[PDB]
């Protein structure tokens with residue numbers, strides 16, 4: 001049993017809810033929240049800007065030190081950093097950004113990072129301002145992630161379309 005409430009069950013391991021991932025993280029304090037990161041960990045907008053704002057920019061300060069030491073992530077890659085006030089840990093995952101021309105096949109590699117964690121609160125990778133089709137992102141998630149993933153979908157309209165169209 002875990003703390004997640006109000007989710008619709010899609011599969012054995014994937015759950016979905018219409019929710020602001022920031023408000024959800026603040027309520028649940030999950031072990032792992034996933035950030036929709038870029039390779040520079042520049043948390044300007046979308047999910048990353050919202051998560052970082054909720055940490056009062058502490059996420060960005062920590063991220064800048066990580067990049068100064070390690071250099072940029074790979075598209076499809078990840079790193080584990082602090083969850084600050086939102087979670088124990090933040091798994092920063094880089095899905096391909098279609099609005100930069102990145103290979104959508106890298107979305108499966110991105111979701112494979114989730115399998116290193118037993119339970120996660122996450123957004124749909126490469127959705128929103130990363131430009132991918134969220135229906136596709138949900139299918140890759142279901143077909144890739146084997147650990148227990150609680151997906152937060154901010155837009156109610158999109159949430160209802162994802163549920164209604166789910167195979």
Ligand SMILES: O=C(O)c1cccc2c1OCO2
Nearest residue numbers: 020021046047128152153154
């Ligand atoms: O997927 C998004 O575009 C998004 C952007 C910001 C915050 C969020 C989101 O979904 C969960 O909560």
